[PDB]
A and B are shown apart, each in its own frame.
Chain A
């Protein structure tokens, strides 16, 4: 009867406690900016760090005593962790033979094998066998991907909907079949008719699209400025046009000036018109009203809101160098 959080897609991050203690165990020692002579990666169980064969031999290659790393690691990792969870420990060794290790949640492969209740050597690529391994919903892969961000400081990025396809991809690569995908339908709901299901899905998916759009919107806002500048598509160009615009600069850059969002500085009718006619001279796109030129050429990987913001005169009229 219970349904925990019913809202349009606010289950994104894991809960508070996980994020917090993971914030202070999984972490980044700041890069000292020395010359790194070793970049190491290990698989080490939570409570047990050994001076044994991999890490002991590898530390004795530099003449370093492995006991200290093992001790700091064990003291850091023994509380807070369920047993038999293998962690990725990345040790960076600089030219002073001073080092910095990072601790990271298990490989995605581990999470996939656990979420499938599959131990080692039960799972392989499809053409190598010819039969799929265990079914998986996209629901599960979202909570596998929840666990691996780029930076625990900001678990949001990269955005979930993207990095899910990574996990889905790896799983697929393992021979895992899927539900919503790899098969024509989605796992059957008991309580509803099919048209109910699909009419749900059509509104939910577009709600998701809006949310995501505003997410990468503010995400782009946080970034340095140069991305909100002008990178025109080269796709509308007629290939001979592209390469002959590679043979000399003036075509490509007059094209850049001709199609630019109307902005206080770049808005001039005098130099813009003769740019358009310089392009029409050599037979670059000649059917264009300037206002559709500001459409066909615009940064395509640039998100929606800033792109309609740039296509508009008013919202772009406000930004001027004051003094």
Chain B
């Protein structure tokens, strides 16, 4: 849908520099060449895919001193990204929040080895989403027969 989307694309403003030591173009190359491929899916389906639009500078990209063009009010100054440890449970999320197939978490809970305590909570909310999916159709099937995949698909 076209509604609720930005009609203009403001730019990045770099306020202060995260490092005091400027990098060589050969460092900026070896880092950017590291990010051009990345993994998708976590399981026996694991696919190396190519990442479009990799920023020129890796060191200077998201990590600090950059102002985001998310500003909203008139007097709102573009928020300047602060240091890593200043953001709560960020290192924790670097472990916790990623793509988890349910199987993968289940066997972690049964082996009693969790990467993070949050993966507990991650698991339960997953299970709930699945049986939610169950509870919905059971409410729909209640009112009329809804037959799965009997209709012709596409055109």
The chain A residues found within 8 Å of chain B, CB to CB, are: 1-12, 14, 17-18, 21-22, 43, 79-82, 84-86, 105-107, 109-111, 113-115, 117-120, 126-127, 130-140, 142-144, 146-147, 159-161, 164-165, 168-169, 172, 177-183, 186-191, 200-201, 204-205, 207-209, 211-212, 300-301
A-B interface contact total, Cβ < 8 Å: 233
Given the complex, which residues of B lie within 8 Å of A22, measured CB to CB?
A: 73
Whole-angstrom CA separation of A100 from B39 in the bound complex: 47
B58→A188 contact, CB < 8 A: yes
Whole-angstrom CA separation of A43 from B6 in the bound complex: 12
Contact residue among B16, B52, B91, B99 (Cβ-Cβ distance under 8 Å from A134): B52
B72→A9 contact, CB < 8 A: no
A212→B88 contact, CB < 8 A: yes
Q: Contacts A138-B94, A183-B35, A204-B91: A81 and B79 contacting too (C-beta < 8 A)?
A: no
Contact residue among B19, B58, B90 (Cβ-Cβ distance under 8 Å from A142): B90
Whole-angstrom CA separation of A114 from B80 in the bound complex: 15
Among B10, B62, B68, B92, the most chain A Cβ lie within 10 Å of the Cβ of B62
Q: Which of B31-88 contact A (CB under 8 A)?
A: 31, 35, 38-40, 49-55, 58-59, 61-64, 68-76, 79-88
Contact residue among A5, A7, A117, A143 (Cβ-Cβ distance under 8 Å from B12): A117
Given the complex, which residues of B lie within 8 Å of A191, measured CB to CB?
A: 19-21
Whole-angstrom CA separation of A249 from B65 in the bound complex: 61
Q: Encode B5-18 as 1/0 by CB contact (under 8 A) with A.
A: 11111111000111
Q: Chain B interface residue count: which class?
A: 35 or more
Q: Contacts A80-B74, A179-B62: A132 and B40 contacting too (C-beta < 8 A)?
A: yes
Give the shortest distance, in Å, between B118 (CB) and chain A (any CB).
8
B86→A7 contact, CB < 8 A: yes
B51→A4 contact, CB < 8 A: no
Q: Contacts A132-B40, A161-B89, A201-B91: A84 and B7 contacting too (C-beta < 8 A)?
A: yes
Whole-angstrom CA separation of A145 from B62 in the bound complex: 15
Give the shortest distance, in Å, between A279 (CB) and chain B (any CB).
24
Contact residue among A43, A132, A212 (Cβ-Cβ distance under 8 Å from B52): A132
Whole-angstrom CA separation of A49 from B72 in the bound complex: 18
Contact residue among A18, A81, A109, A205 (Cβ-Cβ distance under 8 Å from B91): A205
A120→B2 contact, CB < 8 A: yes
B92→A187 contact, CB < 8 A: no
A168→B88 contact, CB < 8 A: no
A177→B4 contact, CB < 8 A: no
Q: Contacts A1-B20, A3-B83, A191-B19: A111 and B70 contacting too (C-beta < 8 A)?
A: yes
Whole-angstrom CA separation of A72 from B117 in the bound complex: 48
Given the complex, which residues of B lie within 8 Å of A180, measured CB to CB?
A: 90, 93-94
Given the complex, which residues of A lie within 8 Å of B19, measured CB to CB?
A: 189-191
Q: Please provide the 5 A-B residue pairs with the shortest distance between their CB atoms, ordered closest to farther.
A: A137-B62, A161-B89, A180-B94, A205-B91, A181-B98
B23 an interface residue at 8 Å Cβ cutoff?
yes
A10→B61 contact, CB < 8 A: no
Q: Which residue of B lies closest to A235 (CB)?
A: B109
B97 an interface residue at 8 Å Cβ cutoff?
yes
Give the shortest distance, in Å, between A212 (CB) and chain B (any CB).
6
Given the complex, which residues of B lie within 8 Å of A172, measured CB to CB?
A: 99
Q: Contacts A18-B73, A131-B52: A182 and B98 contacting too (C-beta < 8 A)?
A: yes
Q: Contacts A3-B83, A84-B7, A138-B94: A177 and B61 contacting too (C-beta < 8 A)?
A: no
Whole-angstrom CA separation of A200 from B83 in the bound complex: 13
Among B21, B87, B121, the most chain A Cβ lie within 10 Å of the Cβ of B87
B88→A181 contact, CB < 8 A: no
B50→A131 contact, CB < 8 A: yes
Known: A82-B74, A147-B72, A190-B18. 10 other contacts (CB 8 A): A6-B83, A115-B68, A117-B9, A131-B49, A137-B63, A139-B62, A139-B90, A161-B90, A181-B98, A187-B59
